[model samples]
Target chain A: SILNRPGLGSIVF
Target chain B: TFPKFAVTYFQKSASHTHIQKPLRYPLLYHENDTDHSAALDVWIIILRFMGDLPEPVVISDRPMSNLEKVHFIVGYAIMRPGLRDEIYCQICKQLSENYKTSSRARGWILLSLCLGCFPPSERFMKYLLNFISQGPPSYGPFCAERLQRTFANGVRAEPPTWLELQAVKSKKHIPIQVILATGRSLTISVDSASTSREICQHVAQKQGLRDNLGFSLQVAVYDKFWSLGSGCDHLMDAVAQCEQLARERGESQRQAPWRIYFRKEFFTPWHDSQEDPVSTELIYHQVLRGVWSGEYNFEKEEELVELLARHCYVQLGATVKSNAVQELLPSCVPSKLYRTKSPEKWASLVTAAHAKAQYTQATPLAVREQTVEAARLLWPLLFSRLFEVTTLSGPRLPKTQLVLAINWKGMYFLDQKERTLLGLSFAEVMGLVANKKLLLATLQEEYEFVSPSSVAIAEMVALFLGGLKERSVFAMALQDRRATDDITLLPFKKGDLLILTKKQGLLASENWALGQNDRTGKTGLVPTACLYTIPSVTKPSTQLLSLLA
Candidate 1:
């Protein structure tokens, strides 16, 4: 499962 | 077998002519040597990707045969670097054969060979050079004259210019009639390579007019709405489109006069006029009429009432709707149609304005000025609310978590206590970027905001700035490059990293991106290819060193 992170940068698979 | 021959009746249908032919493989040779069956298979496999086009263009009166289709496939194959050498060898063989015997077929084959080398080819250049030098005179006549003109500029590493090649390939030249609104007309021969902007510049220069943004080009096929309204379209493409339309209309004509109309207009401008000032009286009257007719739906009725209460300098108490309170208001009845606050205060202003118009005998200008001044004080607040969006301040700051609202006009940060912490306008914005995360900056502060993606921020900021914005990833540096005025000067060896930033609508060219330093807090333009998007770091909170922190 991918959790949302409150941080800078794009989420990549 | 059951003997079903008892009812053998034969009926023939002509529509059954559709028959699927076996795929044919053409021979592929490399470097004027023996045929390579493997290369032939490779070429066939490559051609399968070209999609199912007709043997040739279907519009041609005579359909192309299988051999011609093979020639076309080979031509296309030569465009790829891997297959180019093999395809060229085949072209050379075709060139070496049947000069006096069947010059027409040989010429056709040569033409096919020529078609393979699109978008400039040094190999094609070398072949043309050799053909003109030693190729048989009989075959030379077809390619020699044009090849001479092509190589006339002398050989270079790159293929000959498209314009020169196009001129040799297609003998048709664009004849344009530059028709000015002043009733003066000029004729010019435009090349296939010329764009509308260039043509406009040429016309301006020839007509002794200043070559500037004030001049524009409008081209149409007479009354046909070709609509060449300052679009940077190639003249050849426009003509081709017109020809396509003409073909659709069953008109087989090839060449026709293109009507070029010259005028002065700006297609794109730096700034747009948002609104113009109007007479105060007219503005007031328009507002009144708008309310009466439901044209202005009191969308900001609450704010309007508050402004009126402040104007009358009265407490908007229990007399929110009483006529005793209404006399001081403008028109409470219309304002009450919605959730109007201190409706009586609005009624009071209306009554006072009526009496002032009758009693003070004030000039329309004075009345208008008085009302307009009130409106000027009132509308900016209402307008800001309508245009703003909520965003959190960018990262690395104690104030980063504060809810900030930004609109095209200005920005406002609200603390947990709902108090405005800071206000800013777009003029204060230094830079905006997204790299695994999005950030906005002022000279003294950096603000990071979480978004679904950087693109969202780019779109919003672009709208807020009333212009284009680019969402790019900072890759890496090319060299130590710096900008002074317009030119990029070099301090090579101490070469500044050519930081590549990739995004659409960059400040300058498509290849260039805005490069900025976080520590020193500086910005410049750099190429996009050098930049790579890194996942923004997820760092824990730390003590700030600088304001940009």
Candidate 2:
């Protein structure tokens, strides 16, 4: 239930 | 500064190979002695969880690698999604310092997750605004823009004001989002002096709601929602109290844990949509969410199919795109029922059922009104809301999660899997007492249910119990046993005492008198034709003609 960047999903840059 | 492969969740050079190769020994160490790589084991554990930081490792003193810092921030939010206020403040301060670069990606990562869900201290608000104002990807072709959009929009900095602690208690109104039953929200500001009714009035006025009755600003108590009083509850102050409690309990959600829901608190006597179309629509929305959210028990399939068809009808009408019905299906269907059908299959059934509903001449309003009317007939439990409770009965198993519903009909107890464990026709209950645990004294036995919430359940029970229960009299038993073909029919045995809502002769033409099986705790229509009241001391045979006509 955590929020994530849309296309990035849960991946970090 | 580290290679991407070094910090990646898997195939990470740091975890797999860096330690074995020559790595810089902490130069004895790290300077400014308060700092160290304190969270590397944490890094190991979370990376294990990531494979398996896999969480407070997001916070640490120095000697912590830059790679671990960024990975832990992302992973902590990905898994458990919340941090203490000090952690929040630290993240904000760090983001403020480097939103332009050093902390760019990680900055947006922290803000995107924490922005609306957790508020920063008042001091950090300007930093969030400055980051927000900085605009498009400064250096990157697309990277920064993508990160900015992800953390912005429907997201804003929510800051805590110690004005409540002002001079340590100066008072400035705090902005709180009032969530509608539809799940949409309107952000309104509230002060300690403002009452819940005032807030509801403003929201209802803004939404063009004609009648405000039955609506209340409810706060979440565990999973169940309890309304702030319809009378003088200090709306914002109550919200702050809940916010304070959530902080104390260390509970957090993807969204702010303290919520004020603008919902229908309780249903009153039934009426048609034409009586109050706005109110009907409000109730309809609340009821719709409740049913689709899997809080209700469905006895028949058509009931569900009809509800979905009507819901889609009101929402978008007969016209639908190829996969629209899939979206229309209940979002949280019960696991057992959810397992029985494919989404496409359910869509086909639902659309086919929608086709059968002659909605050509009916306006969408008429369709919704019909849905509400039909829902009332289909589920007796619809009139009441469901609250999850743990039963602590003296005679039953030690502990079990159960659904406790107190409606106009009576109090009903159902198991999580949907079996009616107990139903008390308020008439069947001798009395009850509630504190942390609610103890019901029925004519037969006493049952106890413990609520996970504070005294909210007791307050709710006492409030709902305010409705009068008629003095139920045992009437003539049916000499013939009847089979139950319709769920609405009261399945009666030849000997079971029935509490008829009306005398047999009084409603002879109607054939059905609302009745509850005194021993069974079930209410439904029972045929008056077979009942001949045996004269009892409560009533005399001298009044037999009154029963006749």
Candidate 3:
């Protein structure tokens, strides 16, 4: 399962 | 039932029509095109003005004379130095004379300074001042200078100076009270006043004043109000006064109170609104033609506020509200977090759903046969929401892929953001492609895909879910070239990078374009254009950099 990550640019799949 | 509009005064017939006459006058296109070019320039200039002044300067002082009120308006209008000239200054002094004599010398001088020292006929200058001062901040005729020049110049005076001909020809003029932003009532009536200045040759002879008699001095005045911008600052007060005076002109024709009893009887004699109730609402429409031109870097914020404050509400033609249904903006659910409270199959896809529903609902997509039809509409919507999403998502860590929950705020895709997001969505589609996903399985056969209405919902959902924020996994794609193509970037060999101008220098590219550095891959690789890189770079350099990091 994919999880949310901090310090990202724009959340892309 | 109520349509948002303004009931502006328009003449029944043009002083003249465009096609019938030769447009050879001073500003006509065939001739000098001063007015014609200015007509177009006026629009470009106003677009610049919107960026210059986005808000309005609030006023609260009572002006002494009508022309002093002219100062605030004329000041703002002539703020464009290009529009100012000797004539403009001359007219300013004359208007100042009226203000000084009629109100006080100070008021006249103040307005004169505002309008520039341009010398124009007192009547025409007054009219021009009224155009800018009066009406909504972002008023229509969208191009006021040219429109005013055209209106005052008359049809015989060619070149279509004023862009308000259609509006003037179509709308009827009448008298009524206008309500302003400050909650003050402005009375606009036929200027029935008999002034010495209006005495034409015919009227002059009859009055036995042969010097300059028989003139029609038909003009209207706003029983002059004192309510202006607060703090009693002379400048702000003048702006308000001028704004109020100019605004009074449009509100001249309102539905008089006694019309209800006399509508049937009044139509033949003097027509008035019967079943149709007309009023005006001032709205702010920002002119975004110019955002950061050099001319107005000074007082930028205050200018913007003035632009916004310039909006005025005017009633459109009268209509019966009871007979018609009122259209209201659609209700949209605003959820910051995307956690689904209800149990539904789609709910598991994201934390929250149903976002920007209102915006989508309001905008109807047109069917087309061109490559750009959908993109034309979609691109703008996407960019509008980019910054909003950027700010909202800034707090989160970089996610390779995460389910997005949009609760409140309109959902849109930015070009920069959408380009990569499209690549990600394509990945999902390509997955289905391998499984033979066809249009036939569009409705219910596919688990994620649904019918048309639901398709729109799913499209937005899938697009949102596909975003991975900043990081790109080269190993995740079919080819490195494929990913680079999606981002609109180029690639090449590594060692030559030191010699060649990097992507940063391509197409007048500056440091502001983006970060200038080597990626985990070779400084010169498929992601970085070959033209930009020095010779001899390879993909191995990229992998080595990533491993080292």
Candidate with the greatest DockQ versus the true structure? 2
Each candidate: chain B TM-score? 0.33, 0.44, 0.19
Tell how far residue B20 is off in model 1, in angstroms: 24
| The candidate that achieves the highest lDDT relative to the unseen native structure | 2
- Models 1 onward score TM values of 0.33, 0.43, 0.19
For model 2, state the Cα shift of residue B89 in Å: 36
Extract clashing residue pairs from model 2.
B46-B53, B46-B54, B47-B54, B48-B52, B49-B52, B165-B168, B165-B169, B166-B169, B166-B170
Candidate number that wins on TM-score, 1 or 2: 2
lDDT of 2 by residue, B1-549 (tens): 111212332221223221212222221122332222422333332223222122234323333443334334433433332222223333333333342342345444434333322343344344444544553443232223323432332221122212222211121345778888666899886543456767888898778887665576767643434556454455544554455456557764212455677876455332345566777776687767666545455778888887888877777686865367787674635556767978888888888888887457267778777866665555566455556678777564334777666554567776655567776654354556767777767656777878754255455555544433222234655564565677797776665666675543434566667777766777887767766543222332323323332
Taking the tens digit of each residue's C-alpha lDDT, what string does model 3 give over B215-275? 1121122322221111111222222333444555654222111100000000010111121
Error of 2 at B113 (Å): 32
Q: Distance (Å) between predicted and true CA of B451, model 3?
A: 40
Ranking by lDDT: 2, 1, 3
Q: Find the 10 residues in a row with the least total lDDT in model 3 chain B.
A: B259-268
